[PDB]
Swiss-Prot record:
InterPro entries: CysQ/Inositol_MonoPase, Inositol_monoP_metal-BS, Inositol_monophosphatase-like, Inositol_monophosphatase_CS, INPP1_dom_1. Mg(2+)-dependent phosphatase that catalyzes the hydrolysis of the 1-position phosphate from inositol 1,4-bisphosphate and inositol 1,3,4-trisphosphate and participates in inositol phosphate metabolism. Inhibited by Li(+). It comes from the Eukaryota. It comes from Bos taurus (Bovine). This is Inositol polyphosphate 1-phosphatase. GO terms for biological process: phosphatidylinositol phosphate biosynthetic process. Its cofactor is Mg(2+). One of its GO terms (molecular function) is inositol-1,3,4-trisphosphate 1-phosphatase activity. Residues 238-257 have a biased composition (Polar residues). It catalyses: 1D-myo-inositol 1,4-bisphosphate + H2O = 1D-myo-inositol 4-phosphate + phosphate; 1D-myo-inositol 1,3,4-trisphosphate + H2O = 1D-myo-inositol 3,4-bisphosphate + phosphate. 1D-myo-inositol 1,4-bisphosphate binds at D156, S157, T158, S268, K270, G290, A291, K294, T312. Its EC number is 3.1.3.57.
Length: 400
């Protein structure tokens, strides 16, 4: 009925325009940063423009949603706070408004009086984008607003966003780094069961015209509310570009030859645990930056599995992506719990859940995915991968 999802799409686009604008409006390009932000527990307010563009994007989505579905805005949680410390040590509460006491006047206090940088940004946070399909007269679903909580990651991969590389070549379709790794993640889960229901991934930086220098981006979405529904898989990678431009070509990675001979695996820049088994089916493991980008590789079919072994992924990083993945048959299951309860001794209960915190132990790092994750799109592919049998893995040709 009134889709919260079509709105999450216009608004993720409005977040992407801010994310691009800070690189495109010449003046804004200039306020970059210096250090890797997170001495997190004791209030660690470290890198100034990064955190400003972050808080701003979280705020624009919170408020444009407050403004279209009243009541929603208090159920929108995320990684950023909506407060920044400025130069002088003053804590500033970021409210733009709708019809506003100028966002300009608010940004001036964070930007030391910078009337120019203030106005470049307030202009783009208030530009109205119209962005509208594919679930218009099609997936007319109603979900009771009282059961819905939202997890936002405003600009995922801040290192890559800040390093700014526009020129990296992808190994096999997977970008190891670059602006292509940055995503806007907006996940919607069920407050009582914890289960992701709907998701929007927007990559702001997909194609750049090198003559014109402008970037175009792609937006992906899914919904699993007993009906399961998804974005026509499609980024301009495998469509217009040298491929499905004839009639109905749908047999590229997203549809690729069912299953049988090889695992493709993506892992982070810093991943330090293992690898699978070559003469069984492969050892195509790729490094790729972006927690949301690596999930997107699994969604798109470029990778089969995404494994992250440490505790440094959080709910905002996985929720949007886990929901699109559920709408296609996949999910995200906790890593340590699979490594303990060998897979089928109690089945889909180690799917990540997003309503509960972890013991209130770390205080502030209440919302981490503790013993890592494995994101997958086919449970058959997941059941193959986990079969790395210690004490019997030297038969590298596991018939079963
Ligand atoms: Mg971020
Ligand atoms: Mg993040």
């Amino acid at each position: 009925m009134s889709d919260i999802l079509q709105e999450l799409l216009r608004v993720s686009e409005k977040a992407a325009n801010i994310a691009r604008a800070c690189r495109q409006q010449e003046t804004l390009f200039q306020l970059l940063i210096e250090e890797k932000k997170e001495g997190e527990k004791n209030k660690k307010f470290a890198v100034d423009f990064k955190t400003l563009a972050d808080v701003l994007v979280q705020e624009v989505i919170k408020e444009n949603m407050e403004n279209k579905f009243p009541g929603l805005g208090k159920k929108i949680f995320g990684e950023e706070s909506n407060e920044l410390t400025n130069d002088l040590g003053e804590k500033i509460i970021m409210r733009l408004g709708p019809t506003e006491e100028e966002t300009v006047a608010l940004l001036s206090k964070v930007l030391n009086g910078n009337k120019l940088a203030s106005e470049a940004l307030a202009k783009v946070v208030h530009q109205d984008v119209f962005f509208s399909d594919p679930a218009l007269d099609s997936v007319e679903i109603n979900i009771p607003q009282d059961i819905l909580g939202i997890w936002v990651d405003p600009i995922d991969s801040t290192y890559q966003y800040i390093k700014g590389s526009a020129d990296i070549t992808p190994n096999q379709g997977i970008f190891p780094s670059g602006l292509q790794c940055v995503t806007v993640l907006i996940g919607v889960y069920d407050i009582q069961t914890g289960v992701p229901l709907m998701g929007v991934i927007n990559q702001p930086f997909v194609s750049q015209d090198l003559h014109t220098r402008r970037w175009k981006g792609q937006c992906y979405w899914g919904l699993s509310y007993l009906g399961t529904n998804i974005h026509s898989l499609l980024p301009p990678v495998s469509t217009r570009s040298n491929s499905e431009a004839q009639s109905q070509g749908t047999q590229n990675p997203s549809s690729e030859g069912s299953c049988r001979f090889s695992v493709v695996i993506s892992t982070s820049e810093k991943e330090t645990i293992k690898g699978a088994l070559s003469h069984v089916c492969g050892e195509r493991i790729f490094r790729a930056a972006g927690a949301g980008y690596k999930s997107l590789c699994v969604i798109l079919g470029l990778a089969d599995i995404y494994i992250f072994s440490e505790d440094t992924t959080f709910k905002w990083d996985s929720c949007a992506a886990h929901a699109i993945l559920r709408a296609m048959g996949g999910g995200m299951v906790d890593l340590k719990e699979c490594l303990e309860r060998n897979p089928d001794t109690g089945l889909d209960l180690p799917q990540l859940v997003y309503h509960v915190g972890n013991e209130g132990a770390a205080g502030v790092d209440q919302w981490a995915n503790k013993g890592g994750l494995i994101a997958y799109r086919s449970e058959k592919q997941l059941e193959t991968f986990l079969s790395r049998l210690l004490q019997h893995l030297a038969p590298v040709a596991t018939h079963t």
